Amino acid sequence: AEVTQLSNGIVVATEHNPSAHTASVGVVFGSGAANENPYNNGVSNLWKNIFLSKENSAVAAKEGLALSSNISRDFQSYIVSSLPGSTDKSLDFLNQSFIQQKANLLSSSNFEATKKSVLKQVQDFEENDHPNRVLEHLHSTAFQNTPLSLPTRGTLESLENLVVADLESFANNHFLNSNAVVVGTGNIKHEDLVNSIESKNLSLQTGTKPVLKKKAAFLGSEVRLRDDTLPKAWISLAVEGEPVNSPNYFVAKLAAQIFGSYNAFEPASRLQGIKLLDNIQEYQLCDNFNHFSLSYKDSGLWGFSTATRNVTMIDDLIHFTLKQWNRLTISVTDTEVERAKSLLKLQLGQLYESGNPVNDANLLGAEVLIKGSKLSLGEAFKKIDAITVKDVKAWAGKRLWDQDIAIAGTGQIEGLLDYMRIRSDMSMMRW
Amino acid sequence: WGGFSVSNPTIQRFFALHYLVPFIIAAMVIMHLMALHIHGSSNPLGITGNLDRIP
Numbered sequence: 001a002e003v004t005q006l007s008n009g010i011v012v013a014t015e016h017n018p019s020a021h022t023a024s025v026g027v028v029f030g031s032g033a034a035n036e037n038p039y040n041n042g043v044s045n046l047w048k049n050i051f052l053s054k055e056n057s058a059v060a061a062k063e064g065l066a067l068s069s070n071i072s073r074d075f076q077s078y079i080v081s082s083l084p085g086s087t088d089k090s091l092d093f094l095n096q097s098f099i100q101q102k103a104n105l106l107s108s109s110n111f112e113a114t115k116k117s118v119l120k121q122v123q124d125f126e127e128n129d130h131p132n133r134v135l136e137h138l139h140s141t142a143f144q145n146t147p148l149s150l151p152t153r154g155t156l157e158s159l160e161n162l163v164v165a166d167l168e169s170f171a172n173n174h175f176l177n178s179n180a181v182v183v184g185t186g187n188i189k190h191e192d193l194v195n196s197i198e199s200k201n202l203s204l205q206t207g208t209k210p211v212l213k214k215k216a217a218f219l220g221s222e223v224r225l226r227d228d229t230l231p232k233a234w235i236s237l238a239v240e241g242e243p244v245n246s247p248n249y250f251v252a253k254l255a256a257q258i259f260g261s262y263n264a265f266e267p268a269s270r271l272q273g274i275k276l277l278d279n280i281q282e283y284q285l286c287d288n289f290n291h292f293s294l295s296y297k298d299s300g301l302w303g304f305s306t307a308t309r310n311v312t313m314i315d316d317l318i319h320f321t322l323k324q325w326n327r328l329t330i331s332v333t334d335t336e337v338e339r340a341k342s343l344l345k346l347q348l349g350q351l352y353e354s355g356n357p358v359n360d361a362n363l364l365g366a367e368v369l370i371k372g373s374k375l376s377l378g379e380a381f382k383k384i385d386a387i388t389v390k391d392v393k394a395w396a397g398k399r400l401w402d403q404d405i406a407i408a409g410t411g412q413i414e415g416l417l418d419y420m421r422i423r424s425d426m427s428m429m430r431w
Numbered sequence: 432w433g434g435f436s437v438s439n440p441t442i443q444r445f446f447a448l449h450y451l452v453p454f455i456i457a458a459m460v461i462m463h464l465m466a467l468h469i470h471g472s473s474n475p476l477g478i479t480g481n482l483d484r485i486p
């Protein structure tokens with residue numbers, strides 16, 4: 001039940017778990033949206049979609065195995081789920097239809113059908129979703145002129161201007177062996193440990209990933225798309241988080257989980273909570289919270305996303321959330337910290353140990369590429385109880401106190417005051 | 432004019448009224464502000480300003 005890693009050409013990792021019985025084997029490429037230029041955006045999306053359609057049609061018809069994928073910023077988590085006794089076939093298919101050969105896959109007809117399907121999908125995502133749209137806009141506005149602001153889906157202008165050659169060029173400049181691994185989360189033990197290294201079962205295109213000239217940055221900005229047609233409102237604050245592989249990941253995660261989520265239309269959420277939730281609930285101010293502190297290998301983001309219903313009362317919601325963040329960095333009760341520790345413990349336990357093998361496989365791939373070695377949750381629990389009020393005070397004195405913010409929302413934001421009524425009030429002039 | 436000559440009542444009344452009136456001006460200008468607030472302030476372009484405004 002212990003994760004094993006090595007380094008033999010291509011990194012192979014394994015998180016054995018005979019609890020579940022859905023074996024999964026796949027790859028986790030250490031590149032994606034962050035590793036590609038603004039002018040050719042949805043190349044990763046197109047890859048994922050051509051796979052997820054035609055290879056799905058092939059695999060289900062031939063054998064029994066359902067293949068998924070995921071792209072967040074720098075992954076292509078082409079996980080291929082299977083039965084416990086059917087991992088060799090899955091690996092053989094993966095190495096015979098993803099790395100090579102790509103001729104039977106990139107026919108002009110299949111590529112064009114997938115291209116139009118991707119266009120339709122991104123279009124109706126733009127026309128329907130809203131919290132995801134404002135989150136993508138928040139990324140695109142926080143990291144202007146940097147290979148991290150471009151979204152994980154892409155723009156129609158960038159989507160339309162690529163046919164075959166750009167796709168193959170990106171394939172040959174990022175589907176290498178140096179920054180590609182194999183993940184076997186499920187209930188396999190060592191068959192994957194030896195079958196990945198075989199006479200020829202190896203990714204093509206030996207070499208290295210082209211290093212980006214600039215990594216990441218930050219700057220305060222706004223991208224609002226004010227349109228009164230939409231019913232509700234949407235906003236998303238942000239403060240620069242802490243990158244992965246740093247002695248600040250868990251303290252930032254706790255500093256985010258203190259305030260916690262909130263759904264105003266649930267009998268089991270209004271009653272519980274801390275000061276801001278009560279002071280909001282006295283009137284009607286907000287309708288959802290999401291304190292998220294996302295982190296990436298270049299830089300991380302500590303955010304605060306809402307989707308309210310009241311339109312005249314945006315300013316008061318923002319003012320209260322800012323005063324609560326100041327309260328976080330000035331003085332915190334010990335019971336608050338203890339409750340946060342317990343909640344974050346259970347949240348990590350649920351997230352990392354969900355029964356679905358695909359989630360565990362993707363997270364293991366992310367960690368093995370970024371951290372260089374898997375961090376078993378035992379050490380996380382051991383090192384999480386040591387987080388103390390002084391440490392959080394110190395961390396918030398750096399990341400939060402008078403630091404530039406970025407917000408970006410679509411809807412009836414118009415009531416929101418522009419910048420100096422949401423920025424120069426993070427200290428309330430009496431600390 | 433307080434009589435047939437400029438004398439004590441003349442300047443006395445003039446000074447008392449001078450010391451009184453600016454408070455009436457203050458009342459009138461609080462009315463001025465009240466009347467202003469109903470419909471904002473005009474653009475220099477002489478066109479509708481209801482589109483965007485800053486706090």
Ligand code: HEM
Binds near residue numbers: 463467472474
């Ligand atoms: C003590 C006297 C006065 C005070 C305190 C005062 C105050 C103000 C204030 C605060 C405004 C808002 C814009 C600005 O500050 O200029 C304003 C605007 C205005 N005032 Fe006055 N005012 C006074 C006298 C007058 C007088 C005597 C007139 C005209 C006879 C006048 C006509 C206006 C007009 C037309 C505006 C229009 C603003 C707009 O259209 O954009 N005011 N005044």
